Design an enzyme around this catalytic site. Structure first.
Site, PDB file in Angstrom:
ATOM      1  CE  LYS A  62      20.182  -3.983  -1.294  1.00 33.02           C
ATOM      2  NZ  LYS A  62      21.134  -2.904  -1.194  1.00 33.02           N
ATOM      3  CG  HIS A 115      22.232  -7.889   0.505  1.00 32.86           C
ATOM      4  ND1 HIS A 115      23.060  -7.258   1.336  1.00 32.86           N
ATOM      5  CD2 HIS A 115      22.474  -7.829  -0.890  1.00 32.86           C
ATOM      6  CE1 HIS A 115      23.765  -6.332   0.159  1.00 32.86           C
ATOM      7  NE2 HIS A 115      23.541  -6.906  -0.740  1.00 32.86           N
ATOM      8  N   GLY A 134       0.715  -1.389   0.071  1.00 28.16           N
ATOM      9  CA  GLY A 134      -0.043   0.001  -0.036  1.00 28.16           C
ATOM     10  C   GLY A 134       1.101   1.453   0.078  1.00 28.16           C
ATOM     11  CB  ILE A 157      10.407   4.488 -10.376  1.00 26.79           C
ATOM     12  CG1 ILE A 157      10.381   5.559 -11.273  1.00 26.79           C
ATOM     13  CG2 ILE A 157       9.060   4.121 -10.147  1.00 26.79           C
ATOM     14  CD1 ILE A 157       9.660   6.046 -12.425  1.00 26.79           C
ATOM     15  CG  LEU A 158      16.358   7.994 -10.299  1.00 26.96           C
ATOM     16  CD1 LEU A 158      17.216   6.728 -10.653  1.00 26.96           C
ATOM     17  CD2 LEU A 158      16.273   9.030 -11.326  1.00 26.96           C
ATOM     18  N   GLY A 159      16.054   5.552  -7.362  1.00 26.82           N
ATOM     19  CA  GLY A 159      17.105   5.884  -6.164  1.00 26.82           C
ATOM     20  C   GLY A 159      18.518   5.924  -6.402  1.00 26.82           C
ATOM     21  CE1 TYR A 186      25.973  -3.488  -0.715  1.00 29.12           C
ATOM     22  CE2 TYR A 186      24.632  -1.444  -0.821  1.00 29.12           C
ATOM     23  CZ  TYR A 186      25.070  -2.863  -1.256  1.00 29.12           C
ATOM     24  OH  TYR A 186      24.063  -3.400  -2.150  1.00 29.12           O
ATOM     25  CE  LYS A 218       0.465   6.653  -4.371  1.00 28.12           C
ATOM     26  NZ  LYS A 218      -0.225   7.962  -4.889  1.00 28.12           N
ATOM     27  CG  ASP A 241      19.707  -0.015  -2.758  1.00 25.89           C
ATOM     28  OD1 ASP A 241      18.793  -0.826  -2.282  1.00 25.89           O
ATOM     29  OD2 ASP A 241      21.035  -0.555  -2.684  1.00 25.89           O
TER      30      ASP A 241
HETATM   31  N1  LIG Z   1      21.150  -6.299  -3.983  1.00 23.36           N
HETATM   32  C1  LIG Z   1      22.378  -6.663  -4.352  1.00 23.36           C
HETATM   33  O1  LIG Z   1      22.825  -7.826  -4.212  1.00 23.36           O
HETATM   34  C2  LIG Z   1      23.163  -5.543  -5.123  1.00 23.36           C
HETATM   35  C3  LIG Z   1      24.161  -5.654  -5.750  1.00 23.36           C
HETATM   36  C4  LIG Z   1      24.673  -4.733  -6.627  1.00 23.36           C
HETATM   37  C5  LIG Z   1      24.396  -3.429  -6.478  1.00 23.36           C
HETATM   38  N2  LIG Z   1      23.242  -3.190  -5.900  1.00 23.36           N
HETATM   39  C6  LIG Z   1      22.948  -1.789  -5.524  1.00 23.36           C
HETATM   40  O2  LIG Z   1      22.709  -1.174  -6.984  1.00 23.36           O
HETATM   41  C7  LIG Z   1      23.515   0.101  -6.854  1.00 23.36           C
HETATM   42  C8  LIG Z   1      23.853   0.313  -8.498  1.00 23.36           C
HETATM   43  O3  LIG Z   1      24.902  -0.574  -8.734  1.00 23.36           O
HETATM   44  P1  LIG Z   1      26.461  -0.463  -8.751  1.00 23.36           P
HETATM   45  O4  LIG Z   1      26.755   0.376  -7.771  1.00 23.36           O
HETATM   46  O5  LIG Z   1      26.854  -2.059  -8.772  1.00 23.36           O
HETATM   47  O6  LIG Z   1      26.746   0.042 -10.421  1.00 23.36           O
HETATM   48  P2  LIG Z   1      25.991   0.939 -11.311  1.00 23.36           P
HETATM   49  O7  LIG Z   1      25.232   1.733 -10.444  1.00 23.36           O
HETATM   50  O8  LIG Z   1      25.553   0.113 -12.373  1.00 23.36           O
HETATM   51  O9  LIG Z   1      27.494   1.947 -11.751  1.00 23.36           O
HETATM   52  C9  LIG Z   1      28.054   2.396 -10.777  1.00 23.36           C
HETATM   53  C10 LIG Z   1      29.037   3.221 -11.737  1.00 23.36           C
HETATM   54  O10 LIG Z   1      28.911   4.061 -12.623  1.00 23.36           O
HETATM   55  C11 LIG Z   1      29.369   5.365 -12.653  1.00 23.36           C
HETATM   56  N3  LIG Z   1      28.411   6.268 -13.046  1.00 23.36           N
HETATM   57  C12 LIG Z   1      27.428   6.690 -12.409  1.00 23.36           C
HETATM   58  N4  LIG Z   1      26.569   7.549 -12.968  1.00 23.36           N
HETATM   59  C13 LIG Z   1      27.560   7.746 -14.117  1.00 23.36           C
HETATM   60  C14 LIG Z   1      27.475   8.701 -15.255  1.00 23.36           C
HETATM   61  N5  LIG Z   1      26.220   9.625 -15.569  1.00 23.36           N
HETATM   62  N6  LIG Z   1      28.484   8.704 -16.434  1.00 23.36           N
HETATM   63  C15 LIG Z   1      29.289   7.776 -16.238  1.00 23.36           C
HETATM   64  N7  LIG Z   1      29.427   6.887 -15.213  1.00 23.36           N
HETATM   65  C16 LIG Z   1      28.399   7.063 -14.267  1.00 23.36           C
HETATM   66  C17 LIG Z   1      29.817   5.411 -11.224  1.00 23.36           C
HETATM   67  O11 LIG Z   1      30.718   6.323 -10.985  1.00 23.36           O
HETATM   68  P3  LIG Z   1      31.102   7.721  -9.908  1.00 23.36           P
HETATM   69  O12 LIG Z   1      30.540   6.847  -8.630  1.00 23.36           O
HETATM   70  O13 LIG Z   1      32.528   7.649  -9.863  1.00 23.36           O
HETATM   71  O14 LIG Z   1      30.396   8.707 -10.259  1.00 23.36           O
HETATM   72  C18 LIG Z   1      30.380   3.899 -10.796  1.00 23.36           C
HETATM   73  O15 LIG Z   1      31.542   3.758 -11.025  1.00 23.36           O
HETATM   74  C19 LIG Z   1      24.805  -0.085  -6.003  1.00 23.36           C
HETATM   75  O16 LIG Z   1      25.401   0.721  -5.395  1.00 23.36           O
HETATM   76  C20 LIG Z   1      23.732  -1.003  -4.637  1.00 23.36           C
HETATM   77  O17 LIG Z   1      23.279   0.099  -4.089  1.00 23.36           O
HETATM   78  C21 LIG Z   1      22.698  -4.152  -4.978  1.00 23.36           C
HETATM   79  O1  LIG Z   2      26.134  -7.973  -2.950  1.00 21.86           O
HETATM   80  C1  LIG Z   2      26.073  -6.674  -3.251  1.00 21.86           C
HETATM   81  O2  LIG Z   2      25.159  -5.868  -2.819  1.00 21.86           O
HETATM   82  C2  LIG Z   2      27.094  -6.180  -4.122  1.00 21.86           C
HETATM   83  O3  LIG Z   2      28.352  -7.105  -3.908  1.00 21.86           O
HETATM   84  C3  LIG Z   2      28.865  -7.174  -2.504  1.00 21.86           C
HETATM   85  C4  LIG Z   2      29.115  -6.049  -1.856  1.00 21.86           C
HETATM   86  C5  LIG Z   2      29.632  -6.261  -0.660  1.00 21.86           C
HETATM   87  F1  LIG Z   2      29.715  -4.954   0.036  1.00 21.86           F
HETATM   88  C6  LIG Z   2      30.331  -7.238  -0.140  1.00 21.86           C
HETATM   89  C7  LIG Z   2      30.247  -8.283  -1.062  1.00 21.86           C
HETATM   90  C8  LIG Z   2      29.608  -8.218  -2.153  1.00 21.86           C
HETATM   91  C9  LIG Z   2      29.417  -9.459  -3.011  1.00 21.86           C
HETATM   92  O4  LIG Z   2      30.387 -10.134  -3.013  1.00 21.86           O
HETATM   93  N1  LIG Z   2      28.229  -9.841  -3.201  1.00 21.86           N
HETATM   94  C10 LIG Z   2      27.890 -11.123  -4.245  1.00 21.86           C
HETATM   95  C11 LIG Z   2      27.389 -12.321  -3.262  1.00 21.86           C
HETATM   96  C12 LIG Z   2      27.149 -12.209  -1.906  1.00 21.86           C
HETATM   97  C13 LIG Z   2      26.630 -13.075  -1.212  1.00 21.86           C
HETATM   98  C14 LIG Z   2      25.975 -14.414  -1.794  1.00 21.86           C
HETATM   99  C15 LIG Z   2      26.520 -14.331  -3.253  1.00 21.86           C
HETATM  100  N2  LIG Z   2      26.039 -15.491  -3.903  1.00 21.86           N
HETATM  101  O5  LIG Z   2      26.467 -15.608  -5.196  1.00 21.86           O
HETATM  102  O6  LIG Z   2      25.310 -16.469  -3.306  1.00 21.86           O
HETATM  103  C16 LIG Z   2      27.163 -13.276  -3.950  1.00 21.86           C
END
Ligand SMILES: NC(=O)c1ccc[n+]([C@@H]2O[C@H](COP(=O)([O-])OP(=O)(O)OC[C@H]3O[C@@H](n4cnc5c(N)ncnc54)[C@H](OP(=O)(O)O)[C@@H]3O)[C@@H](O)[C@H]2O)c1
Ligand SMILES: O=C(O)COc1cc(F)ccc1C(=O)NCc1cccc([N+](=O)[O-])c1
EC number: 1.1.1.21
Length: 316
Positions: free
Chosen positions: A78, A111, A10, A15-17, A49, A12, A44
């Site tokens: 997470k 996570h 329920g 869509i951009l974070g 992290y 909102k 996020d």
């Molecule tokens: N749930 C999960 O397991 C999980 C896993 C991965 C990621 N995430 C979340 O998703 C977020 C985003 O993914 P990500 O951090 O992996 O990578 P991403 O957002 O795909 O890429 C980040 C990279 O892109 C660069 N960048 C950003 N905007 C740009 C632009 N306008 N022009 C050029 N380069 C640009 C950044 O540089 P600068 O910062 O130097 O500007 C950084 O090096 C994470 O930070 C995290 O919050 C979650």
């Molecule tokens: O998991 C994220 O959000 C991004 O990747 C990481 C960020 C961190 F600060 C530290 C570690 C990772 C990372 O290795 N994340 C990858 C990961 C984690 C746990 C389990 C798996 N799996 O394949 O089952 C993979």
């Protein structure tokens, strides 16, 4: 385009974070302050992290300055893998709340589906480098997450990196009290995720696309790797629309009815990345971007590939 999507709780969700993985602790406070100043209302986060305290300094300062009201922010964190245990979930959430300076989270995610042995190390290893699992299954972890809703610590709960069979396990849980609101998964033109996205959307679960730019700063990047930001075909679509490649890469998931969380610590890019509500990709643009799928997955961990709940053996 509408700025928020209605969740199955329920509430909102914007869509951009702003993503925060890899944002250095000495830069992320300013990054989040700038983000809020230029319109971001969703951050996020994650305990793993190691920068939630610094993210929280920014959030609290913008609340104190009355730049934004708490109800206007959507803060996500997470539960890390070493806290899947019934007796550890609440304290893990409370540590995140303490660090972020908050009295509730808008959304709290499992996570990864893989639970690990509790302890100080985020990846406990055996002597041969395999992660040491926990025996706590995803359903008992989910029940612990549901308690956080009932205790007022979180408004919504969800999952991340769950494959469709793992989502289905939660949906089929005996006595399920709260459905997952979100599944946060890797998604970009080289890993388009059609099958998992359609499954989740068909169940009313909102999908958040992480690494929408391909995570070019991920620690294990190699110089020869594919590069979304440098792909000439994507640059051409951007040029046609008088937008940057990053802006196209952010608008793409938005038009698939996904939430998207690009990370930056660069103030100019934080502002640029938000300027995506004033143009539209055509359905031909969208289908063309989808066509670039190569099943190129940037986020995983070799140490986890034998864990019983490793998510990426299944096709989707
Ligand atoms: N749930 C999960 O397991 C999980 C896993 C991965 C990621 N995430 C979340 O998703 C977020 C985003 O993914 P990500 O951090 O992996 O990578 P991403 O957002 O795909 O890429 C980040 C990279 O892109 C660069 N960048 C950003 N905007 C740009 C632009 N306008 N022009 C050029 N380069 C640009 C950044 O540089 P600068 O910062 O130097 O500007 C950084 O090096 C994470 O930070 C995290 O919050 C979650
Ligand atoms: O998991 C994220 O959000 C991004 O990747 C990481 C960020 C961190 F600060 C530290 C570690 C990772 C990372 O290795 N994340 C990858 C990961 C984690 C746990 C389990 C798996 N799996 O394949 O089952 C993979």
């Amino acid at each position: 385009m509408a700025s928020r999507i209605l969740l199955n709780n329920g509430a909102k969700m914007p869509i951009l974070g702003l993503g925060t993985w890899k944002s250095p602790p000495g830069q992320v406070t300013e990054a989040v302050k700038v983000a809020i100043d230029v319109g971001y209302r969703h951050i996020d986060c994650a305990h793993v992290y190691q920068n939630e305290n610094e993210v929280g300094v920014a959030i609290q300062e913008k609340l104190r300055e009355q730049v934004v009201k708490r109800e206007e922010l959507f803060i996500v964190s997470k539960l890390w893998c070493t806290y899947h245990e019934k007796g550890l979930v609440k304290g893990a959430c409370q540590k995140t709340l303490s660090d972020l300076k908050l009295d509730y989270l808008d959304l709290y995610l499992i996570h990864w589906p893989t639970g690990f042995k509790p302890g100080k190390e985020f990846f406990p290893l055996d002597e041969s480098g395999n992660v040491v699992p926990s025996d706590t299954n995803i359903l008992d972890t989910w029940a612990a997450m549901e308690e956080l809703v009932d205790e007022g610590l979180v408004k919504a709960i969800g999952i991340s990196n769950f494959n469709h069979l793992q989502v289905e396990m939660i949906l089929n849980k005996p006595g399920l009290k709260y459905k997952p609101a979100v599944n946060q998964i890797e998604c970009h033109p080289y890993l388009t995720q059609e099958k998992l996205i359609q499954y989740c959307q068909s169940k009313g679960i909102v999908v958040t696309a992480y690494s929408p730019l391909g995570s070019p700063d991920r620690p294990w990047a190699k110089p020869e790797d594919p590069s979304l930001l440098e792909d000439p075909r994507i640059k051409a679509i951007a040029a046609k629309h008088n937008k940057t490649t990053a802006q196209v890469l952010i608008r793409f998931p938005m038009q698939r009815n996904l939430v998207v969380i690009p990370k930056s610590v660069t103030p100019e890019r934080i502002a640029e990345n938000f300027k995506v509500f004033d143009f539209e990709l055509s359905s031909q643009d969208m289908t063309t971007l989808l066509s670039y799928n190569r099943n190129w997955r940037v986020c995983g961990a070799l140490s986890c590939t034998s864990h019983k709940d490793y998510p990426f053996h299944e096709e989707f």
